[PDB]
Design a protein around this ligand. Structure first.
Ligand SMILES: CCCCCCCCCCCCCCCCCC(=O)OC[C@H](COP(=O)([O-])OCC(O)COP(=O)([O-])OC[C@@H](COC(=O)CCCCCCCCCCCCCCCCC)OC(=O)CCCCCCCCCCCCCCCCC)OC(=O)CCCCCCCCCCCCCCCCC
Ligand SMILES: CCCCCCCCCCCCCCCCCC(=O)OC[C@H](COP(=O)([O-])OCC(O)COP(=O)([O-])OC[C@@H](COC(=O)CCCCCCCCCCCCCCCCC)OC(=O)CCCCCCCCCCCCCCCCC)OC(=O)CCCCCCCCCCCCCCCCC
Ligand SMILES: CCCCCCCCCCCCCCCCCC(=O)OC[C@H](COP(=O)([O-])OCC[N+](C)(C)C)OC(=O)CCCCCCCCCCCCCCCCC
Ligand SMILES: CCCCCCCCCCCCCCCCCC(=O)OC[C@H](COP(=O)(O)OCCN)OC(=O)CCCCCCCCCCCCCCCCC
Ligand SMILES: CCCCCCCCCCCCCCCCCC(=O)OC[C@H](COP(=O)(O)OCCN)OC(=O)CCCCCCCCCCCCCCCCC
Ligand SMILES: CCCCCCCCCCCCCCCCCC(=O)OC[C@H](COP(=O)(O)OCCN)OC(=O)CCCCCCCCCCCCCCCCC
Ligand SMILES: CCCCCCCCCCCCCCCCCC(=O)OC[C@H](COP(=O)(O)OCCN)OC(=O)CCCCCCCCCCCCCCCCC
Lengths: 606, 106, 178, 170, 459
């Protein structure tokens, strides 16, 4: 009971140490990226210890380190709920972030602010672990907003780029709408259960939770970039590739899914919330796969892939399978970390060149990166007994064999087939065909700082799903008695998607121009959602602001009403009263009028 | 059409001055004027593990045992899984096993 | 970038710009090099077959129709070079493009870190100080009393002289400062 | 442990004895033994040194107790002296009731975390205690406003008792 | 309280008797010592209130305002001692005397136990800020700004004086504790409605309420840096403190009389946040942000919930600190480039990295980043407003979204982006102004660490 808490708080202390070293004025004498990478790997080992403990005895922990404040009947205390979810996500996030730190040390070379980059990544990791391990909703909010702000900074890393600043701002905007949902849920729970503590939420499981669950759904939509609040993630690909990987591929974007997993005991008793989560997740995974079908930037392709997988997790939460959603969080974190790392190595080898139309022959010119990219693509599509088998195929079996919406099921299967399709698109246009890059070959992937984190993520993407799923305590009883076409559905549609995409790519190889179609235009232009919404809503909002509020109210009508009208009235009155002619004849006639009026007033008053 | 002689001569002179400026951007070999390795396993990981890990582990363990366990509901854990046939360490009793399992088909 | 745009684009310049943009979008559609070379030779054949037009009113009409066809058949996501505007690496190092006048505000310790560079900087400053009066006189002489004025600038026309307004061109930050 | 099980109840732990079927060594047992020998021994040594230093310099402090001043019900209106004394006593009791509610809520949270999967059945008495003390707190302190006072609490209690008496007529 | 009032009084002979080469140093050091002395009011180990004398008392609400005033005096001196270097010695000492008199009168106003003395010190604080704005302001419009400020406040405060004299005639003493104990319930007639409006409209003017907020943006724009700091960090909070003090004797008709002002506050915070979105002046943007935050404070005080009162106190302290910090950063840029245009200076992150860090931290405080006391106050105000009516969450959410939008827009357009390389007159940084930013940010961190100090009367 002491070693467990000591390990958790030692994770947090080891994460906080490079921040103090950064502000302690000895960075100029040490190797700060290497020191931080060693800090992350030691944090990962010290987090492996409670992973083993929970795999042994399934101890479920709640740790109240520090008492912050007491406000009448609400006792705000810094508490950590060390769950299955907290422990496993902490270990996976630390392993991924170790790979990310080493890859950042390789990739952000010849960068004057590499120490600031590493410090920002460390701050994001600290806030992400706060968000993951938080026991109360206020501390959950602290981690949530810290993660959002560090995302803003890391997207706007190259702050001289206007598009980067715009992407960071719109990520802040969509996340703030999610924050509005989060605040609605938090306020409802404070008013009706007198705490933000998860234990009193568990005691709130037995009544109508429609308003807080709707607020949590809005928060999850904003954070996980579901439909309606999606485009900030592919916009957020504007940051550097390690930022893209760690933030928007493995750790930050699964926070809304983690929030709904956290509040799944409330969610199981509300059928409307489950149905709308299922519909929303199916819609966003179909839409994002369709958008990913015709993209050209490789980072955009894998970002829309990330959004499609988040939609799949939202579908899994729409069914009463939160643990499958968390397992898919872990497996997808491994896949997207290694995929983004391989894509970043491709980009750095091709000199900051990012779209697939000027790539090719990668299988022969970059064999290690091509091998790991193929491994990641196969494990994302769900090749058998890789890390994607133990989450994605169970999700497909559950959605086939449980009572759900028919159209959501159909578009989920179509989205899985299209996931295979865009993975084949990546494989074809990058690793296959003839070279299309500029002639000067500057490919050099022989750095151990590049090879070793990709190797660790490859070992993860091969064996981690197997190890995790065989160490998971049995929960959420899967069904296994199904017909053959409901059992091999995911494998069949993945193979069909690969074959269809291969045939389409060979048709593109065929020497003939075809007329463009509205389906391909809709897919390439992201469903017209960014253009239409990001042009009509900022225009209406800012035009309403300037043309109504500032001008019409403050600079025109409030001034016309109170101060200028008062000054005008008193100026008119003082002119009317000081318009005297200076004639004592008129003055004495006025005095006579005054005398008569006084006599009349006395005579009527009596 | 191509360059005018005006713009061509201006670009030539500006580019020559740019060459001179970029050449002057170089650094002299004295620039800038600034005013126990063993092996990685035996030394480099050793002092780091004993400094940044072991001493913080000491402080964290001290705080956990003598300032958190001394408080009532600070560290609360769920009850352990008790299966039939287990012996309770604290109480000393053995709970009875289950029934006869009539199905032995698989 | 290094040349100022004129008052208007002539017809030949508009046609050449259309040709280059059409080839770029054709390569964005074709992707593969052999397919691109085939269809680019076809596009060149179209431009060659409409090249010898003498009416020039029909030539402007053909340019308008070709532009309409291009806007109908353009790629929604054309290929952009990374350093080109709209690209991924465009304006990436503007955060590092520090202007040269912060060395004026540098502390004497930081100047003492780099003696030779600051000596050469002082030489450049003295050259700028003399050349400014020389070039202001030259620009006053070169300005037309009235008429048409463009953004082109004269060169140095005498020995021992520098082109006018050369400072912000010569001492601009590098494209890869680090 | 400065706390007592009378006000922070805790069921006795029932841990099962280890029954290792496998022949593999337990890395958890190895790491706990190493962790004890490396960390727990020096920490308990320095804590024993600190405790013996405190025993060398031992001091005591007491818990202040207030006598019961007369209640506001026997205070004449406009007599600000006894009204002030009763108002201060009421604010003191209000703060004590806030901390009582904090104690009950902390006890309920501890019950929920201890039971885990069986909290819907094994925390029945904790939830009943929480519900009863919440109902009493709402009857005595709810809807008073930001300027809550003994006079407002007395007026609310009088209104509630009048409603109860009128309901008891029929 | 006299042990704080007397040496603050003795600061004036120190100012007028110090050498011209030692005046700033001596007054800054002894005002820091004054603040350290004022920290002894936090020694509250009992539920009672520290009634020091028959005319001075301390409160869990009055104490943070007094400490904030005593802390803001040396920060005002440090902020204002740069634009007075090309200034006459007697004028510099007069400016320091104006700041010291403001601090003295504000401390006495917050520590007052009698509402007529509160009103006298209210107007006494009205005088020297008008003098500062009119005399040491920069543009032509400082005279119109001073007139607007002075007469908005005066037309507000005259019916307050009439109402205070009426309540004194009805009750007998106009002492705060006596009123709090022998409060009588009003019978809700038209005379009592007018009495309510008379005793609330002065504080609503100085808060400022929406529609009558027009004095604030021009006053803050035309004021010097110390005047903007003292205005946005103390005087609006003085209006809120007056509302909290006077609202205890207005039961029960505040329950229905609060309705127009809550609507005005919510829709006005939305409108002013929109103005911040479309505003071309940085000090105007900060002023309208202050209007929105004080509208939140107005709504909390009107709904009269203990959560609302605590959130109001926390937002008062937090907004005072962060608004003074934002004004000081904007004044640093104004002393650099001699302009207040929002879009003129853009790439300042490149040249001023540590100042950009201060800008980022100030804006994160402004948009209520957790776990700061800004978010504490805003969150508890939101909780109380949702308890009052569940549909207020829409207005709260819109306000939060636009708040984050204008804060991050300010950061991007002032720090991020390409550098305006024509601004050759960018001096690196002053240790004085970096110290000023640090002395603003650190108390925010400490109050975030211990938020029990600024909870206020209710908890
Ligand atoms: C539970 C958790 C709750 C909190 C959760 C928070 C979540 C949200 C986080 C937002 C982070 C925002 C951000 O990115 O800020 C960047 C900002 C600076 O990053 P940067 O962009 O590299 O800026 C460097 C400059 O541009 C250029 O400067 P440089 O490159 O030369 O860097 C040198 C370094 C040098 O740093 C210093 O000199 C440190 C200054 C303080 C020294 C204090 C000494 C005390 C001695 C006592 C005896 O300067 C800095 O790092 C920044 C200076 C200002 C930092 C002020 C931080 C608060 C200080 C409070 C002091 C209180 C004293 C009380 C008495 O860092 C911080 O704000 C601090 C780290 C983040 C917060 C703390 C860590 C997380 C919470 C832990 C608990
Ligand atoms: C082989 C070697 C093994 C070594 C083992 C350890 C031995 C050892 O050192 O034992 C501790 C040894 C004796 O321990 P002990 O007598 O058993 O402990 C009794 C307590 O210290 C009695 O307490 P105390 O009041 O005497 O001293 C503690 C006091 C010390 O405080 C001060 O000294 C005041 C500050 C002075 C600043 C000067 C600059 O701290 C506080 O009052 C609170 C500090 C809180 C710091 C963290 C704040 C977190 C804020 C989070 C904000 C966000 C919340 C989000 C919430 C979300 C959920 C709602 O010495 C100390 O305890 C002194 C430590 C002083 C640390 C000073 C630096 C940090 C401040
Ligand atoms: C900043 C806003 C300024 C304008 C609004 C000010 C408040 C508006 C509502 C209150 C009325 C005006 C102030 C009255 C102060 C005294 C209140 C009081 O004691 O009430 C109880 C008293 C009643 O006395 P009583 O309470 O003893 O009643 C006796 C009742 N019985 C017999 C049953 C026991 O109300 C009045 O006497 C009010 C008379 C007001 C007449 C003069 C009004 C002049 C115009 C006012 C606004 C002028 C400035 C703005 C001009 C335009 C600018 C654009
Ligand atoms: C089956 C069911 C289906 C249900 C579907 C439901 C759909 C719901 C949709 C809810 C969200 C709608 C509003 C989203 C607004 C997003 C605006 C945005 O971020 O625009 C970004 C844009 C620039 O970005 P862009 O042009 O895309 O890319 C740059 C490339 N050069 O522009 C900018 O960056 C401009 C800068 C910001 C300007 C100020 C914006 C203020 C907005 C205030 C909004 C207040 C009301 C919010 C209401 C939310 C309700 C949910
Ligand atoms: C939503 C809430 C709604 C309810 C509340 C409404 C009221 C809110 C508070 C009132 C605010 C009023 C503000 C008054 C000051 C603004 C006017 C002003 O500044 O006018 C300036 C002008 C002189 O300008 P000047 O300087 O000469 O020229 C410019 C350059 N040379 O000045 C002039 O020309 C004349 C100025 C006259 C003096 C104005 C201030 C005193 C007003 C006295 C009011 C008396 C009320 C009773 C009247 C009799 C009964 C009806
Ligand atoms: C960063 C956030 C850290 C949050 C935890 C702060 C721990 C220090 C602290 O506040 O200690 C207070 C404690 C005295 O408090 P208490 O026990 O209530 O007093 C009764 C007896 N006078 O005083 C002590 O315990 C004094 C002895 C402290 C010895 C070192 C403690 C190191 C603690 C390391 C883990 C802290 C939490 C790690 C997770 C942070 C996540 C952001
Ligand atoms: C600016 C927006 C103004 C309009 C806001 C929307 C309408 C608000 C109406 C209102 O205040 O209703 C509350 C109350 C209802 O009447 P009731 O509670 O029965 O009071 C008995 C009166 N003898 O109404 C009343 O008691 C009537 C008097 C209310 C006066 C409120 C303030 C008016 C504006 C002053 C500035």
């Amino acid at each position: 009971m002491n070693i467990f808490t000591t390990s958790i708080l030692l994770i947090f202390i080891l994460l906080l140490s490079p921040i103090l070293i950064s502000m302690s004025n000895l960075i100029k004498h040490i190797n700060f990226p290497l020191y931080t990478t060693t800090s992350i790997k030691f944090s990962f080992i010290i987090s492996l210890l409670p992973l083993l403990m929970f795999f042994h005895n399934n101890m479920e922990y709640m740790i109240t380190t520090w008492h912050w404040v007491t406000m009448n009947s609400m006792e705000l205390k810094m508490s950590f709920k060390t769950d299955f979810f907290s422990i496993l996500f902490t270990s996976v996030a630390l392993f991924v972030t170790w790979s990310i730190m080493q890859f950042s040390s390789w990739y952000m070379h010849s960068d004057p602010n590499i120490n600031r980059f590493i410090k920002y990544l460390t701050l994001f990791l600290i806030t992400m672990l706060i968000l993951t391990s938080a026991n109360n909703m206020f501390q959950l909010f602290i981690g949530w907003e810290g993660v959002g702000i560090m995302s803003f900074l890391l997207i706007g890393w190259w702050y001289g780029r206007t598009d980067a600043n715009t992407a960071a701002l719109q990520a802040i905007l969509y996340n703030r709408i999610g924050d509005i949902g989060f605040i609605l849920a938090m306020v409802w729970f404070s008013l009706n259960m007198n705490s933000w503590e998860l234990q009193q939420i568990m005691f709130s499981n037995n009544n109508d939770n429609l308003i807080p669950l709707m607020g949590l759904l809005i928060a999850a939509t904003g954070k996980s970039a579901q439909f309606g609040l999606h485009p900030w993630l592919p916009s957020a690909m504007e940051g550097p590739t390690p930022v893209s990987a760690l933030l928007h591929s493995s750790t930050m974007v699964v926070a809304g899914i983690f929030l709904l997993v956290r509040f799944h005991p409330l969610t199981t008793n509300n059928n409307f919330i489950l149905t709308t989560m299922l519909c929303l997740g199916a819609l966003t995974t179909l839409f994002t796969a369709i958008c990913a079908l015709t993209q050209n930037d490789i980072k955009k392709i894998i970002a829309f892939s990330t959004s499609s997988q988040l939609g799949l997790m939202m579908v899994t939460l729409g069914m009463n399978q939160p643990h499958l959603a968390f397992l898919h969080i872990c497996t997808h974190a491994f896949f997207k970390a290694m995929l983004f790392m391989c894509s970043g190595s491709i980009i750095h080898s091709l000199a900051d060149e990012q779209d697939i139309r000027k790539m090719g022959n990668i299988t022969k010119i970059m064999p290690f990166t091509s091998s790991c990219l193929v491994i990641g693509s196969l494990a994302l599509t769900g090749m058998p007994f890789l890390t994607g088998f133990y989450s994605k195929d169970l999700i497909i079996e559950a959605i086939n064999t449980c009572n759900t919406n028919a159209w959501a099921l159909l578009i989920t299967l179509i989205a899985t087939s299209m996931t295979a399709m865009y993975s084949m698109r990546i494989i074809y246009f990058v690793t296959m065909t003839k070279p299309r890059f500029p002639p000067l070959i500057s490919i050099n992937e022989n750095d151990p700082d590049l090879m070793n984190p990709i190797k660790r993520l490859a070992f993860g993407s091969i064996f981690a799903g197997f190890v995790i799923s065989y160490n998971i305590p049995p929960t959420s009883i899967p069904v296994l008695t199904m017909p053959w076409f409901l059992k091999t559905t995911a494998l069949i549609i993945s193979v069909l998607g690969f074959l269809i995409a291969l045939e389409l790519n060979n048709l593109t190889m065929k020497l003939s121009m075809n007329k463009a179609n509205p389906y391909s235009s809709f897919s390439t232009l992201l469903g017209f959602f960014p253009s239409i919404i990001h042009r009509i809503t900022p225009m209406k909002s800012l035009n309403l602001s300037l043309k109504t509020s500032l001008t019409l109210l403050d600079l025109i009508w409030l001034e016309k009403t109170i101060p200028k009208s008062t000054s005008t009235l008193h100026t008119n009155m003082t002119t009317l009263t000081t318009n005297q002619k200076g004639l004592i004849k008129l003055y004495f006639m006025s005095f006579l009028i005054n005398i008569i009026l006084i006599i009349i007033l006395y005579s009527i008053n009596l | 059409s191509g360059y005018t002689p005006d713009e061509k001569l201006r670009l030539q002179q500006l580019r020559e001055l740019r060459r001179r400026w970029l050449k002057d951007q170089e650094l002299s070999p004295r620039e800038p004027v600034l005013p126990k390795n063993m092996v990685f396993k035996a030394y480099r990981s050793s002092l780091f593990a004993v400094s940044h890990v072991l001493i913080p582990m000491w402080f964290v363990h001290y705080y956990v045992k003598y300032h958190m366990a001394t408080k009532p509901y600070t560290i609360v854990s769920s009850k352990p899984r008790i299966f039939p046939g287990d012996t309770i360490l604290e109480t000393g009793e053995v709970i009875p096993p289950m029934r006869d399992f009539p199905d032995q088909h698989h | 970038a290094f040349c100022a745009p004129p008052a208007y684009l002539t017809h030949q310049q508009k046609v050449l710009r259309l040709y280059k943009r059409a080839l770029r979008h054709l390569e964005s559609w074709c992707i593969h090099r052999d397919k691109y070379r085939y269809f680019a030779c076809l596009m060149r054949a179209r431009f060659e077959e409409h090249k010898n037009e003498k009416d020039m009113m029909r030539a402007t009409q053909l340019l308008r129709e070709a532009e309409e066809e291009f806007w109908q058949n353009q790629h929604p996501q054309p290929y952009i070079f990374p350093d080109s505007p709209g690209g991924t690496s465009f304006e990436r190092y503007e955060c590092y493009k520090v202007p040269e006048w912060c060395l004026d505000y540098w502390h004497p310790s930081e100047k003492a870190m780099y003696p030779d560079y600051f000596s050469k900087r002082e030489q450049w400053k003295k050259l700028r100080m003399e050349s400014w009066d020389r070039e202001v006189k030259q620009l006053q002489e070169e300005t037309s009393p009235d008429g048409i004025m463009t953004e082109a600038l004269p060169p140095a026309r005498r020995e021992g002289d520098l082109p006018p307004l050369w400072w912000h061109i010569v001492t601009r930050p590098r494209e890869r400062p680090t | 442990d400065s706390w007592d099980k009378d006000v922070y109840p805790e069921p006795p732990s029932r841990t099962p004895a280890p029954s290792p079927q496998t022949s593999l060594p337990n890395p958890i047992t190895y790491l706990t033994k190493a962790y004890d020998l490396v960390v727990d021994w020096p920490v308990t040594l320095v804590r024993e040194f600190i405790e013996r230093q405190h025993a060398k310099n031992r001091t005591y402090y007491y818990h202040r107790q207030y006598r019961r001043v007369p209640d506001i019900t026997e205070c004449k209106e406009g007599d600000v002296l006894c009204i002030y004394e009763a108002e201060m006593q009421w604010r003191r009791d209000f703060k004590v009731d806030q901390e009582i509610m904090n104690i009950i809520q902390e006890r309920l949270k501890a019950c929920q975390q201890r039971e885990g999967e069986n909290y819907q059945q094994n925390c029945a008495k904790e939830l009943e205690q929480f519900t009863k003390v919440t109902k009493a707190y709402q009857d005595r302190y709810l809807d008073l406003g930001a300027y809550y006072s003994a006079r407002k609490c007395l007026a609310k209690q009088k209104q509630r008792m009048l409603e109860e008496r009128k309901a008891a007529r029929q | 309280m006299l042990k704080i009032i007397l040496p603050s009084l003795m600061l004036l002979p120190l100012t007028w008797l110090s050498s011209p080469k030692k005046t700033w140093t001596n007054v800054t050091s002894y005002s820091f010592l004054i603040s350290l002395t004022s920290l002894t009011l936090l020694w509250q180990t009992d539920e009672n209130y520290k009634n020091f004398s028959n005319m001075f008392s301390s409160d869990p609400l009055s104490t943070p305002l007094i400490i904030l005033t005593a802390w803001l005096l040396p920060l005002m001196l440090m902020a204002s001692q740069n634009h007075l270097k090309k200034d006459n010695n007697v004028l510099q000492k007069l400016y320091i005397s104006m700041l010291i008199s403001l601090q003295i009168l504000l401390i006495m106003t917050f520590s007052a136990t009698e509402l007529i003395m509160f009103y006298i010190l209210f107007e006494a604080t009205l005088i020297p800020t008008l003098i500062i704005i009119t005399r040491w302001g920069n543009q032509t419009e400082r005279l119109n700004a001073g007139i607007y400020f002075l007469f908005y406040t005066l037309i507000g405060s005259i019916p307050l004086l009439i109402a205070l004299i009426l309540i004194q005639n009805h009750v007998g003493t106009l002492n705060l504790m006596i009123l709090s104990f022998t409060t009588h319930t009003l019978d809700a007639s038209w005379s009592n409605n007018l009495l309510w409006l008379a005793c609330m409209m002065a504080f609503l003017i100085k808060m400022p309420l929406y529609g009558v907020h027009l004095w604030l943006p021009k006053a803050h724009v035309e004021a010097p840096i110390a005047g903007s700091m003292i205005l946005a960090a103390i005087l609006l909070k003085l209006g809120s403190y007056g509302m909290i003090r006077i609202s205890i004797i207005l039961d029960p008709l505040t329950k229905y009389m609060a309705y127009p002002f809550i609507l005005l506050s919510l829709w006005g915070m939305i409108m002013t946040s929109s103005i911040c979105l479309r505003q071309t002046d940085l000090k105007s943007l900060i002023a309208y942000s202050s209007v929105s935050h004080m509208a939140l404070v107005i709504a909390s005080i009107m709904i009269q919930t203990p959560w609302s009162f605590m959130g109001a106190t926390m937002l008062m302290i937090a907004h005072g600190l962060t608004s003074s910090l934002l004004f000081c950063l904007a004044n640093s840029n104004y002393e650099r480039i001699h302009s207040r245009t929002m879009i003129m200076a853009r790439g300042l992150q490149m040249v001023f990295p540590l100042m950009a860090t201060w800008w980022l931290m100030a804006s994160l405080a402004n948009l209520a980043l957790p776990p700061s006391i800004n978010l504490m106050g805003e969150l508890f105000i939101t909780m109380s407003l949702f308890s009052w009516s569940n549909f207020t969450i829409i207005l709260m959410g819109i306000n939060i979204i636009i708040t984050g939008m204008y804060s991050m827009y300010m950061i991007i357009t002032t720090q991020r982006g390409k550098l305006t390389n024509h601004m050759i007159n960018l001096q690196p940084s002053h240790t004085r102004e970096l110290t000023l930013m640090a002395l603003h940010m650190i108390p925010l961190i400490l109050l975030t660490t211990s938020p029990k100090l600024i909870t206020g009367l209710t908890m």
